[PDB]
Amino acid sequence: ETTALVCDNGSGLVKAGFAGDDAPRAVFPSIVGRPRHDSYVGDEAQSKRGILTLKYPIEHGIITNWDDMEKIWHHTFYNELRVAPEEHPTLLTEAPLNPKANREKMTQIMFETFNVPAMYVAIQAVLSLYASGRTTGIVLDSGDGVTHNVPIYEGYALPHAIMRLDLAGRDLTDYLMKILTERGYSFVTTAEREIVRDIKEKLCYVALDFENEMATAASSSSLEKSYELPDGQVITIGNERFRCPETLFQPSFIGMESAGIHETTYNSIMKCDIDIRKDLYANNVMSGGTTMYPGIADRMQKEITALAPSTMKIKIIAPPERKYSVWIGGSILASLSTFQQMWITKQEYDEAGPSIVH
Amino acid sequence: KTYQSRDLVLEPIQHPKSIELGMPEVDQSVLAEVAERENVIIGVRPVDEKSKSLIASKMYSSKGLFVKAKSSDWGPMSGFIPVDQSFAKASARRDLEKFNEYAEQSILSGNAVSANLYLNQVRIEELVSKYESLTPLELDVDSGMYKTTATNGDQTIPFFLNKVTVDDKELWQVHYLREGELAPFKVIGDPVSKQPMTADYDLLTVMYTYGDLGPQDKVKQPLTWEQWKESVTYEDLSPKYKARYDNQALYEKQDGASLGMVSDRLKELKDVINTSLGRTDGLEMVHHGADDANPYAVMADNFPATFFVPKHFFDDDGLGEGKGSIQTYFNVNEQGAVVIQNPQEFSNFQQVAINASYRASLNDKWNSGLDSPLFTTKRKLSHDYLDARDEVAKKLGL
Ligand SMILES: Nc1ncnc2c1ncn2[C@@H]1O[C@H](COP(=O)(O)OP(=O)(O)OP(=O)(O)O)[C@@H](O)[C@H]1O
Ligand SMILES: Nc1ncnc2c1ncn2[C@@H]1O[C@H](COP(=O)(O)OP(=O)(O)OP(=O)(O)O)C[C@H]1O
Ligand SMILES: C/C1=C/C(=O)O[C@@H]2C[C@@H](CC[C@H](C)/C=C\CC1)O[C@@](O)([C@@H]1CSC(=O)N1)C2
Ligand SMILES: [Mg+2]
Ligand SMILES: [Mg+2]
Ligand SMILES: [Mg+2]
């Protein structure tokens, strides 16, 4: 009668908890800090920042530093969840298009290093769709390091139509730091990057009509907002509020030749069977922290409508808890005891090796 | 007009009742605005109705964690904190030895002083005429003082009021019979101003949107000034925290042990609340963490509670499509305070707020004394989570 664990390994945040719960118990930064002349994970690494070099083990949703990822998982089990991993089946999440060698290495660490009794690896965007009570639809999942379009039909992702856009939250914060120089402000350091991330989360929004919003900001101060820095200094933000998330729709703002999130969504639906397109258009689910901008669902509704045939019903589902939809979907999946079938047991790993995950 | 969601059925309130609250109406209005501005649900534990004019006057400071002795809710000492805790509210008279020791230690350690109790004519009129807590004053000729009586519960105790002139104000000093002898009544006063302290506003809980959940929601145990210094990097702190890093006395007074078990969200919201109330520089009403993190929580002493919610809860179908408004199912007063009268009604309110995307923090001590443990992780699961799980199980053949 052991409770399964659910761990969403994000480029910026790790979300961890127990299957059966409606929210993760632990949410902390995906960072490992080493003294700058023995190791800190998450909150403590950020808190002790001034005396640590910080590293991100996950780049663009993909685990790249396995030794640092082991520290994150050890901290998740022993310090955050306070569980013994050998007693809990563990569901881990992966980015769409995660290389086979990566999930095999992930499987090898779970069984050999943590000795889990069983494990399952789920695609992050598929879990978001489950969190909204659906098994068919198209997910736009945009987090800290990467953005994806994942069309899903009856529980299964359609791999040929998956779209990856490297633009995500961190690039938007870097872009906000950059365009803030255009009003005389200078944010450059790692600590200053965190102040800009906070300005972005609090004051940014997606304009329904970008050009009209730029005209309004240019001729009046009605769209301006004040923001108090930690040291008491008050700064003013104007058109940067909507220019920053506009990059999702116009990636050329940051030098990227890629199509915008509205275009990748449409192109993704167009790569799917005609008989299923109506089901994707009516079930466009948004998830991840970078879809949290006010006005993003309405802007996506307007943009998809202009691209899709007039007879098509377009619906954007953007739940208030969409920053945690991937974790929620993993909790739903791992708590259905009738799903104790697709889990890879430790006995099966001992016989077949890491390839059993495929 | 009926709230129906899974096993939760709520009927509209028939004949809404007026509930007296001790929190001044202006303070309720401020907290209603804080809830809207900050987009959080703020719950505050009861304040006795007779503390209202004391708190509203803005004259007194209030008791934080270092003053665990209870306020009194009866007699001439109503709203103040008696040094002899047999004159305090019933929870204190229940464990008299423990509460008398708290009162004494708070004074002997310098966290409070022993002050005399002076009541003006206005407070005497309030106690005699408005609340009927004291019987009319009878001129006892054998002392010069004016005799009055009060009930604690089954017993009637006499008090003697003496007219005095202190700091050019005409007041009544409270006296009582200490072992068959007339003695000045003592109350706990502020260690700096020496004036009697009133009860505080104890946060019952703060419910934050699911979208804003993060590291600031981690409840932390108090740290010593040394341990806190080592855990933070000076350069990243605000002027408020740099001052505490450079001054041990400032840290111990406004942080560490003085807050108890608290999250970063709550530390900041406490400052927002006190600033919005105009309660700074020693007159703060919120001193510590919420009851949801209190290991010594007593569920029976948590009601009636006042809840302050974001304004969309009062809109047509504010609770969601076809669910109606908060005031339809819970009693809401003129200031926008949702008055929660018992554990069952608090359990219903929490489930409604959780379904509307506001996160609960559950204290297991809240289940102590209940017929059934309403405040558990499983019983408080969001209905969107449970419905999506039902749908996925049905659709995937699971
Ligand atoms: N309210 C908000 N408004 C705008 N952006 C936000 C908001 N909240 C979070 N973000 C951004 O979302 C990111 C964190 O979200 P999330 O947890 O979904 O990412 P992740 O899972 O770590 O990353 P990935 O899935 O891309 O590997 C950060 O860029 C953060 O700044
Ligand atoms: N977050 C917390 N962490 C640790 N202890 C806490 C926390 N919240 C409350 N406490 C404990 O509960 C106490 C709060 O109650 P307190 O204000 O002293 O009395 P009360 O029951 O409200 O009556 P009066 O205020 O005296 O009228 C103080 C402390 O002993
Ligand atoms: C509050 C919070 C937010 C977040 O999303 O944090 C994650 C993880 C974080 C790691 C470094 C930082 C100093 C530590 C903790 C902050 C965690 O980096 C991020 O802020 C990066 C850099 S700026 C940006 O937008 N993303 C995202
Ligand atoms: Mg993610
Ligand atoms: Mg109190
Ligand atoms: Mg208190």
Author numbering:
A (entry chain A): 4 to 40, 51 to 371
B (entry chain B): 466 to 863
Q: What do the study's own words say?
A:
The catalytic domain of NC toxins can be divided into subdomains CA and CB, with the catalytic site located in a groove at their interface.
On the basis of these structural data, we designed a minimal functional Vn-ExoY module (residues 455–863) by removing the C-terminal disordered residues 864–895. This Vn-ExoY module (shortened by 32 C-terminal residues) shows similar catalytic activity to our original Vn-ExoY412-873 construct and allowed the determination of two additional crystal structures: (i) nucleotide-free Vn-ExoY bound to actin-ATP-LatB and profilin, with a sulphate ion in Vn-ExoY NBP (Vn-ExoY-SO42-:actin-ATP-LatB:profilin), and (ii) Vn-ExoY bound to actin-ATP-LatB with its NBP filled by a non-cyclisable ATP analogue 3’-deoxy-ATP (3’dATP), at 1.7 and 2.1 Å resolution, respectively. In contrast, the Vn-ExoY-3’dATP-2Mg2+:actin-ATP-LatB structure co-crystallised with 3’dATP shows an ordered Vn-ExoY:actin interface. It thus acts as a lid (hereafter referred to as CB/LID for residues K533-M662VnE-LID, corresponding to K86-M209PaE-LID in Pa-ExoY) that closes on CA to stabilise 3’dATP binding.
